[PDB]
Write an enzyme that holds these catalytic residues in place. Structure first.
Site, PDB file in Angstrom:
ATOM      1  CB  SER A 532       9.173 -23.577  -3.750  1.00  0.00           C
ATOM      2  OG  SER A 532       9.793 -22.941  -4.843  1.00  0.00           O
ATOM      3  CG  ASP A 617       7.232 -18.110 -16.807  1.00  0.00           C
ATOM      4  OD1 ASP A 617       8.179 -17.363 -17.148  1.00  0.00           O
ATOM      5  OD2 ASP A 617       6.102 -18.110 -17.353  1.00  0.00           O
ATOM      6  CG  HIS A 652      -4.540 -18.574 -19.457  1.00  0.00           C
ATOM      7  ND1 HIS A 652      -4.323 -17.808 -20.587  1.00  0.00           N
ATOM      8  CD2 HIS A 652      -5.882 -18.669 -19.315  1.00  0.00           C
ATOM      9  CE1 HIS A 652      -5.481 -17.453 -21.109  1.00  0.00           C
ATOM     10  NE2 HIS A 652      -6.461 -17.979 -20.354  1.00  0.00           N
TER      11      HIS A 652
END
Ligand SMILES: *CC(=O)[C@H](CCCCN)NS(=O)(=O)c1ccc(C)cc1
Ligand SMILES: *CC(=O)[C@H](CCCCN)NS(=O)(=O)c1ccc(C)cc1
Length: 677
Positions: A532, A617, A652
């Site tokens: 990130s 996402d 998940h």
């Protein structure tokens, strides 16, 4: 051997302040996720990664199995007590999700099920429990659940008397909610039905039509996150408004009908403050007089009446506080250590929680009840697995409540050190590293150097079971506590962001150079990882110091910095101007463009690199790393491994979703271990 994918070039000019940058891969951005030529490129790169890494399958299995075999199949939380009930979280083998149980505090034998995630997940594609809280009267259970994985929580209510559900659902919430003291009214935060930013507070009478819910507050500036809190006293529900720089709290009376928000201190640029209420006082952590924060007491809102308990100190960062019957306990940082201090409300007596470890972290754990002498606090070190302690604040009796269990682990096999590196500007940078004693020989061992270095987030030295897979294969693991992080307080952050961001990358290089010079590792076998904003770090450091590293892992990396930060249509961009700056201003354009990894890819030799990204996402949108790899393939002059792995799986929240995370770690570790052989 094999020909890698080659994305089509479509020269897309971007001109700002008279500067034209030509982006050949602008088109890999498809906001709709329809364009099958974009899917084709991500699918082609995945196929190339599967085939390039096929010989590491055996190693990926050995690594996967040894990471899973370290952890238990069972997990039972440490029970805590709140409002006269004991709560425990239970993970059984075979179950995908946690079961939440409780009993009356005076009971031992029997436990009631509050909520069973497995029953809640039945006939749903996704389940995550965002939040769980019983009403003050112990009769109703509020739950915040996500069945779609877009982190839009539904709030529902359960009557504990007969285990029946109420008929309504509160939809598109942040999962942030609080009970009024009537056990009948909840305040909750709605997200914008478009931006999904939290922005409205509603009052809901339980059992009724969400249609009748009253709008209590609407935030006008979408850079202010909207959260709810409840004071230790239970007198006030707090509407907590904050940007990265600036705070504002409104008070809701938690005892009376028809409450409206009561301003505390109105927002003011670069004043950050958070409050609680206890012993008929407000307690305020505020930077009003100093960037490292102080703690104040007041009888009322007005800032002019705030009395100094703890003045800000240049050498000690104040991170947080808990309130107890006879004690204030504060979380601080000094000299690159996290610390806990306790001050007696009456005597003023000061005690320090003392440790004996060069590379550890300590923190205030969950303490939901203030009427005790018993502080729970957490501890972790690079050599000692995570532990919950309970401290008698009066008597100093420290009991262990829980240890992290690690199978096949002998703690004395490992050694850690704190090292300070003199950076190129003379600033001292702390480093935490760990290694296996018996496989160590100076100048010999592969190095894995990990960094983040954005947002004031600290890579605090702690235990990792998964990390053992590198340690037991000769690796020295390094945390580089570079500027942009919070390890040395607010000034460490500010000297690593905006017009100082380059220090983040310079610090990472300086640390790696010093470690090699001083004999911690093999100069030919230096590896690095970041995700990130840590991927921004990986990206800038390989442009500026390509020869330093053999191999890199860059996770979901922020690399298209100038372009993304020029376009408010990209979610997060409006929120991030106080981190990187606003390139619509030429000063920031020039400063950001200098290190923006996508823009500074040039025709030179790069290290081996694995790049990861997600179609669904995501913080960083999938197209940044995809564009980055395509440009790198086009200009890099070396013949080393460059792989893009795009996760296509839908998300998940079960035990299997934890097992996916181990699979990703194994693929990344097998990539690095293959290079180090
Ligand atoms: C990846 C990262 O650290 C952050 C987002 C996570 C925030 C958790 N506190 N952002 S980036 O730094 O990844 C990034 C992504 C998008 C944009 C517009 C800017 C930065
Ligand atoms: C959570 C999960 O992956 C499932 C759950 C067990 C089956 C009971 N309904 N396992 S799975 O093997 O079926 C599976 C499905 C999809 C994906 C992406 C991975 C695994």
């Amino acid at each position: 051997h094999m020909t890698p994918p080659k994305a089509e070039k479509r020269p897309y000019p971007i001109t700002t302040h008279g500067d034209t940058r030509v982006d050949d891969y602008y088109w890999l951005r498809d906001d709709e996720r329809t364009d099958p030529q974009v899917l084709d490129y991500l699918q082609a790169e995945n196929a190339f990664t599967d085939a390039a890494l096929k010989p590491q399958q055996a190693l990926r299995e050995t690594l996967y199995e040894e990471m899973v075999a370290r952890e238990n199949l069972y997990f039972q939380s440490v029970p805590y007590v709140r409002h006269g009930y004991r709560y425990q979280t239970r993970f059984e083998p075979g179950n995908e999700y946690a079961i939440y149980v409780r009993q009356p505090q005076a009971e031992s034998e029997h436990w009631d099920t509050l909520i069973d995630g497995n029953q809640r997940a039945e006939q749903r594609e996704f389940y995550t429990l965002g939040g769980l809280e019983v009403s003050p009267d112990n009769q109703k259970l509020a739950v915040a659940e996500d069945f779609l994985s877009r982190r839009q929580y539904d709030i529902r209510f359960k009557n504990l008397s007969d285990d029946s559900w109420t008929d309504e659902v509160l939809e598109n919430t942040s999962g942030s909610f609080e009970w009024a003291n009537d056990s009948a009214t909840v305040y909750y935060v709605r997200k914008h039905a478009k931006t999904l930013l939290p922005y409205q507070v509603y009052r809901h009478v339980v059992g009724t039509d969400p249609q009748l819910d009253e709008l209590i507050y609407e935030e006008q500036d979408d850079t202010f996150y909207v959260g709810l809190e409840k004071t230790t006293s239970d007198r006030f529900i707090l509407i907590h408004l904050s940007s990265t720089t600036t705070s504002e709290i409104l008070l809701l009376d938690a005892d009376r009908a028809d409450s409206t928000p009561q301003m505390f201190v109105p927002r003011r640029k670069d004043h950050e403050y958070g409050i609680d209420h206890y012993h008929q006082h407000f307690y305020i952590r505020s930077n009003k007089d100093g960037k490292n924060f102080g703690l104040y007491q007041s009888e009322q809102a007005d800032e002019a009446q705030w009395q100094t308990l703890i003045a800000p100190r240049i050498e000690v960062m104040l991170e947080g506080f808990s309130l107890f019957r006879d004690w204030l306990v504060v979380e601080e940082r000094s000299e690159g250590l996290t610390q806990l201090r306790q001050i007696h409300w009456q005597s003023g007596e000061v005690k320090r929680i003392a440790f004996d470890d060069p590379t550890y972290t300590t923190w205030l754990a969950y303490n939901p009840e203030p009427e005790t002498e018993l502080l729970r606090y957490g501890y972790s070190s690079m050599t000692t697995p995570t532990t919950l302690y309970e401290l008698n604040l009066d008597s100093d009796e420290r009991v262990m409540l829980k240890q992290q269990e690690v199978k096949n682990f002998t703690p004395e096999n490992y050694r850690s050190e704190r090292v300070w590196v003199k950076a190129r500007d003379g600033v001292e940078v702390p480093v935490s590293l760990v290694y296996r004693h018996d496989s160590f020989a100076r100048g010999t061992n592969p190095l894995m150097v990990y960094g983040y270095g954005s947002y004031g987030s600290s890579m605090d030295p702690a235990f990792s079971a998964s990390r053992l897979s590198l340690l037991d294969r000769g690796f020295v693991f390094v945390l580089a506590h570079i500027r942009g992080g919070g390890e040395l307080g607010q000034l460490w952050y500010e000297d690593g962001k905006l017009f100082k961001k380059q220090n983040t990358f310079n610090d990472f290089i300086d640390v790696t150079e010093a470690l090699i010079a001083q004999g911690y590792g093999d100069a030919k076998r230096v590896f690095a990882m970041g995700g990130s904003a840590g991927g921004l770090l990986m990206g800038a450091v390989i442009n500026q110091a390509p020869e330093l590293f053999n191999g890199i892992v860059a996770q979901v990396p922020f690399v298209d910095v100038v372009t993304t930060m020029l376009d408010e249509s990209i979610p997060l961009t409006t929120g991030e101007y106080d981190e990187w700056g606003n390139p619509n201003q030429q000063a920031y354009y020039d400063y950001i463009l200098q290190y923006s990894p996508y823009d500074q890819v040039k025709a030179q030799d790069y290290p081996h690199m694995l790049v990861t990204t997600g179609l669904h996402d995501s913080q960083v949108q999938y197209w940044e790393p995809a564009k980055w790899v395509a440009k790198l393939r086009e200009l890099k002059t070396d013949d080393r491994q460059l792989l893009l792995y795009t996760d296509m799986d839908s998300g998940h929240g079960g035990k299997s979703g934890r097992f996916k995370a181990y699979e990703d770690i194994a693929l990344e570790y097998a990539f690095i271990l293959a290079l180090a052989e």
